[PDB]
Ligand binder design. Sequence first.
Ligand code: 1EU
Length: 180
Amino acid sequence: GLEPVRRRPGMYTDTTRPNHLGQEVIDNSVDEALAGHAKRVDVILHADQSLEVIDDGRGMPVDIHPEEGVPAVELILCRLISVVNALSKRVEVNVRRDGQVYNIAFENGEKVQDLQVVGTCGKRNTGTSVHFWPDETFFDSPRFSVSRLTHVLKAKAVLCPGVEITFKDEINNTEQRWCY
Ligand SMILES: CCNC(=O)Nc1nc2c(C(C)=O)cc(-c3cccnc3)cc2[nH]1
């Protein structure tokens, strides 16, 4: 369950700010890049202080695996990036795989929208988007530190030469691009 994360968030993340939540989502995108599948990772800091991370990798698995009765993506989000889900007022996950666009959404660590096919796309159009709204009640400050995000993303870009990383800050109206 995710209740224990909500009871003691500081046992699971840096509760100073939601930056570490951001890093966890970023790490998963970067992993797809390191695995050789993603060529671009975009991060967007929205005006409402929610963070959105998108990669053009293979897309999180949406199928139901033998043994499991629930879509892989749901397990990934709910089975203890599940910490991000636990500590967010809302999380929206969208996946492009197999020429279909899939959506699923959570609030307060609980699913509020079943995995649903909501569109179609090119066969080569693949990737994962995670957009989350941290619950301010778990953090000393709800504000993402922009400098900390930039240090992190510069660090990831150098770790993955050839992968493009972008950061769009819709609060301060800047965009940065790295590609080493
Ligand atoms: C915005 C965060 N990005 C992200 O989570 N990307 C991403 N995350 C994943 C994962 C998991 C487990 O998180 C698995 C596969 C994957 C692995 C094997 C075959 N097909 C897809 C692909 C992925 N791509």
